[PDB]
Amino acid sequence: KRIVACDDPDFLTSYFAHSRLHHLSAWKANLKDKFLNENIHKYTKITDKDTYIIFHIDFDCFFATVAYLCRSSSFSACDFKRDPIVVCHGTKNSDIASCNYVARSYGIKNGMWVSQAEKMLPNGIKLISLPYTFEQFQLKSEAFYSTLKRLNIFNLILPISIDEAVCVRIIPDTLNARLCEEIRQEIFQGTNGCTVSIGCSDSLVLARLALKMAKPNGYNITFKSNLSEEFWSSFKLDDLPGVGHSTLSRLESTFDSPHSLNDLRKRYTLDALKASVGSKLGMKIHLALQGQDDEESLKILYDPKEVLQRKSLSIDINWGIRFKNITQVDLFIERGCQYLLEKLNEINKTTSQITLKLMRRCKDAPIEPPKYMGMGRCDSFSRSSRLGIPTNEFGIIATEMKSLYRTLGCPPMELRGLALQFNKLVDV
DNA sequence: TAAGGTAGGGGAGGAT
DNA sequence: ATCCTCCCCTAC
Ligand SMILES: Nc1ccn([C@H]2C[C@H](O)[C@@H](COP(=O)(O)OP(=O)(O)OP(=O)(O)O)O2)c(=O)n1
Ligand SMILES: [Mg+2]
Ligand SMILES: [Mg+2]
């Protein structure tokens, strides 16, 4: 018990073993890799000439579901269908990694703090908190992916995440529903109690929206020609791929707070969109509202091997960072470079460009954040350098990293987050 | 207390 | 116009 501090040689090890966000990233990176290894010898790209159907498959409230099926006996009293359940580490300003649909019926969301969530529960409803079961999340993911390959349904299976895949059926020149039902059934069995939803369409965007609409353990079909106002009206603006908190806020400020995608599509003009959120994004939203994919989004189908090929490598620590002097910082940077170099050498690459980025306590922010050991409100400072020659040498890299830190001049006591990045990777 | 990581599109504004 | 650095955003 008692958390390993940031000045301890195995801080990274212990922090990563506990951080679900690090797991998410690590699992994602490994899956991309596995895809590249399994397809070294397989013609893989899809063309303009090709006709295809997208089946976007995702586990429902993934950690919550798995953590519940694997729960210790002191929680046997729990009922997934009637009780609000979440997976998290703590009791107050702790992230709810995943919450079940009963919890969502009260307004609880993934990403919300436990303290926030409990305020949303009416008298007589108690929040149930489950621990993370990382190894089990991984075993269910493996079953999911092997099961997909085993049915011999798809021409290609793109791993998006530990619980999500974009599967493609190429159609040469009703069945879809039977297929959706088979996949859901076999995955439910190959996984034991887990559930998966499916969005099926002729565009990646619609498949993703259909997925959201199908979500509570089901499937939804919807093609470009099935679009209706009832379909639009059912989505929040940030249900669009590529639209998060800021884009939402900008869309709202520009088009008189539209509440559903239908309201947005009835009010927008391409030009205003572009002025509001960027053009490409504006352009992406524009196409999405007509059920069409932007070119950027399509590269993953026309060339998965290049899209899935890792182009950078880094660590980003923003919790538990508390230092008193530059010596501790230097040692931390050194260890960070040692960790990254282990990774770099594992994927047989060198780097020609590095970046040190840091989070510094804002002038106006409290010295200790509302969140225990959190970074709190901070300002970003970043600096990069081109290395003369691609290298994997600790000496060159660590020395430049330490040098970049002096240039940004953040007093150690103000440091609250730190990122070490290898931006351009060169081969062999 | 509680584990706020990371890859990789993008755009602003200064350098060419 | 294009390219580069230092961010911001989103995704999961
Ligand atoms: N802010 C977040 C979002 C997600 N995740 C983890 C928890 C989830 O189980 C998993 C999957 O992301 P999803 O968006 O797919 O979350 P769910 O699968 O839990 O919800 P849904 O049923 O809406 O797909 O990754 C997390 O730790 N923190
Ligand atoms: Mg999911
Ligand atoms: Mg997912």
Q: How many CA atoms lie within 13 A of A419 on its CB side?
A: 20
Q: Which two tokens stand for residue A267?
A: 């009010």
Q: What is the DSSP letter of A83?
A: S
CATH number at residue A152: 3.30.70.270
Which of A316, A314, A315 lies closest to A375, judged by CA?
A316
Q: How many Å apart are A378 CA and C4 C1'? A: 26
A3 in any annotated domain = no
CA pair distance A97, A109, nearest whole angstrom: 9
**Beta carbon of A61 within 6 Å of any ligand 1 atom:** yes
Identify whether A125 is part of a domain: yes
Name the residue with the closest Cα to ligand 1, atom 17: A61
**Residue A337 is labelled as binding a ligand:** no
Q: Is residue A4 situated within a structural domain?
A: no
CA A385 to centroid of ligand 1, rounded, Å: 35
Mark whether A406 and A376 lie in a shared domain: yes
Instruction: Spell out a b/e string for A21-41, using b for 16 or more CB atoms within 10 Å of the CB, else e.
Output: ebbebebeeebbbebeeeeee
The alpha carbon of A64 is separated from its chain's Cα centroid by a whole number of angstroms, namely 16
Q: Residues before each break in chain A (C–N > 2.5 Å)?
A: 173
Distance of CA A132 to the CA centre of its chain: 17
Of A276, A291, A311, the residue that ends a domain is: A311
Q: Tell which residue, A302, A297, A264, A341, has the closest CA to residue A50.
A: A302
Same structural domain, A86 and A22: no
CA distances from A66 to A59, A80, A216, A258 (A): 10, 11, 15, 36
Distance CA(A151)–CA(A190), nearest Å, equals: 12
Q: Which residue range forms the structural domain that includes residue A377?
A: 312-428
CA A405/CA A418 separation, integer angstroms: 10
Residues A65 and A78: their CA atoms lie apart, in Å, by 12
For residue A358, give the H/E element and its range: strand A349-361
Tell whether A144 is covered by a domain. Answer: yes
Question: Is residue A74 one of the residues assigned to a domain?
Answer: yes
CA atoms A387, A392, A398, A399: torsion sign: negative
Nucleotide with the nearest C1' to A278 CA: B11
Using alpha carbons, list the distances in angstroms from residue A186 to A66, A148, A170, A217, A375. 17, 9, 22, 13, 43
Other beta carbons less than 10 A from residue A209's beta carbon? 27
Ligand 1 atom showing the smallest separation from residue A66 Cα: 9
Torsion of CA A166, A172, A173, A174, to 10 degrees: -60
Domain-located, residue A2: no
Q: Are residues A57 and A138 in the same domain?
A: yes
Which residues does residue A382 pair with via DSSP β-bridges, in sequence order?
A357
Query: Do A396 and A376 have their domain in common?
Result: yes
For strand A156-161 and strand A128-130, is the pairing parallel, antiparallel, or unpaired? unpaired
Enumerate residues 6+ apart whose C-beta is below 8 A from A225. none
Nearest to A332 by CA among A106, A93, A9: A9
d(CA A185, CA A193): 11
Q: Which residues of A63-79 are buried (b: 16+ CB within 10 A; e: fewer)?
A: bbbbbbebbeeeeeeee
* Type of residue numbered A306: E
Give strand letter and number of the nucleotide nearest A246 (CA to C1').
C9
Q: Dihedral of the CA atoms A128, A129, A131, A134 (nearest 10)?
A: 80
- Residue A372 belongs to a domain: yes
Is residue A144 domain-shared with residue A92, that is, in the same domain?
Answer: no
Tell me the one-letter amino acid at A185.
Answer: Q
Any ligand 1 atom below 6 A from CB of A24: yes
Beta-sheet pairing, A52-59 with A196-201: antiparallel
Distance between Cα A108 and ligand 2 center (Å): 15
* Distance from C-alpha of A35 to C-alpha of A303, rounded to nearest angstrom: 13
Q: Give the CATH number, domain containing residue A37.
A: 6.10.250.1490
Alpha-carbon distance of A146 to A131, in angstroms, equals: 26
| Same domain (yes/no): A101, A233 | no
The answer to whether A104 is a known ligand-binding residue is yes
Beta strands in A283-325 (DSSP E): 313-317
Q: Are A183 and A198 in contact (CB under 8 A)?
A: yes
Task: Please check if A20 is assigned to a binding site.
Answer: yes
**CA–centroid distance, residue A33 to ligand 2 (Å):** 21
Residues at the strand C interface (Cβ < 7 Å): A 21, 24-25, 28, 160-161, 164, 238, 241-248, 355, 357, 380-384, 386
Residue A278 (CA) to nucleotide B11 (C1'), in angstroms, measures 8
Facing residues of A164 across strands?
Answer: A58, A161
A366 contacts: CB under 8 Å, gap ≥ 6: A376
DSSP A128: E
Boundary of a domain, candidates A222, A254, A282: A222
The answer to whether residues A196 and A274 belong to one domain is no
- Tell me phi and psi for residue A7, to 5 degrees: -100, 10
The verdict on A192 and A294 lying in the same domain is: no
Domain membership of residue A174 (yes or no) is yes
The strands making up A85-87's β-sheet, listed across from edge to edge, are: A98-99, A85-87, A128-130
Number of domains in chain A: 5
- β pairing state of A164-170 and A52-59: antiparallel
Q: How open is the CA angle A29-A196-A71, to the nearest 5 degrees?
A: 85
| Size of chain A, expressed as the number of residues it contains | 428
A56 and A30 in a common domain: no
**Resolution of the experimental model, in Å, one decimal:** 2.4
The Cα–Cα gap between A302 and A46 comes to 5
- Phi/psi at A395 (nearest 5 deg)? -50, -50
**What ligand is nearest to the CA atom of residue A31?**
3
Owner of token pair 């970003």 = A380
Q: In terms of domains, do A343 and A428 share one? A: yes
- Residue A24 Cα distances to A87, A212, A242, A301, A398, angstroms: 15, 20, 19, 23, 27
Distance A80 CA to B7 C1' (A): 34
**Exp. method:** X-ray
Q: Phi/psi class of residue A218: alpha, beta or left (left: φ > 0; alpha: ψ in -120 to 50)? A: beta
CB contact at 8 A, A97 and A110 = yes
CA A235 to ligand 2 centroid distance, Å: 17
Task: Tell me the CA–centroid distance for residue A151 and ligand 1, in Å.
Answer: 25
Looking at the structure, tell me whether residues A127 and A234 fall in a common domain: no
- Probe residue for ligand 1, chosen from A110, A113, A114, A162 as the CB with the greatest number of ligand atoms within 8 Å: A110
Indicate if A384 and A427 belong to the same structural domain. Answer: yes
